Write a protein that binds this ligand. Structure first.
Ligand SMILES: c1nc(N2CCCC3(CC3)C2)c2cc[nH]c2n1
Length: 167
């Protein structure tokens, strides 16, 4: 049994809700919240900008030290950093950004990072400002992630389309 409330069950392991990932994080304090990161961990906008704002920029300060030591992530890759006031840990995952011309086949590699964590609160990778079709992102999620994932979708409108169209 876990804390997550109000989710629709899509499969054995994937759940979905109309929620902003941050408010949900603040309420649940999950072990892992996933960030929709870029390779530079520059949390300017989208989910990343919202998560970082909710940490009062502490996520960005920590991320800048990570990059100064380790250099950029790979597209499709991830790192585990603090969850600050939102979660125990933040899994920063880099989905391909279609608005930079990155290969959408890297979306499966991105979701494979979730399998290293038994339970996660996450957004749909590569959606919003990364330009991918969220219906496609949900399909790759369901077909890739085997651990228990609670997806938060940032719009009542879109949420309803993902559910209605789910096979
Ligand atoms: C969950 N998902 C979010 N995304 C923003 C737009 C598109 C998206 C697919 C649903 C991802 C955000 C943004 C801020 N807070 C969020 N929580």
């Amino acid at each position: 049994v876990n804390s997550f409330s109000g989710y629709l069950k899509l499969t054995d392991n994937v759940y979905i809700k109309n929620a902003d990932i941050v408010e949900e994080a603040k309420k649940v304090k999950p072990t892992v919240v996933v960030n929709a990161a870029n390779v530079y961990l520059k949390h300017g906008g989208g989910v990343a900008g919202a998560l970082n704002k909710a940490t009062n920029n502490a996520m960005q300060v920590e991320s800048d030290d990570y990059i100064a030591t380790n250099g950029p992530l790979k597209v499709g890759g991830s790192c585990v950093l603090s969850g600050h006031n939102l979660a125990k840990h933040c899994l920063h995952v880099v989905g391909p950004n279609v608005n930079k011309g990155e290969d959408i086949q890297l979306l499966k590699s991105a979701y494979e990072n979730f399998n290293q964590h038994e339970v996660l609160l996450a957004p749909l990778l590569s959606a919003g400002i990364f330009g991918a079709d969220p219906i496609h992102s949900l399909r790759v999620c369901v077909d890739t992630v085997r651990t228990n994932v609670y997806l938060a979708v940032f719009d009542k409108n879109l949420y309803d389309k993902l559910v209605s169209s789910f096979l």
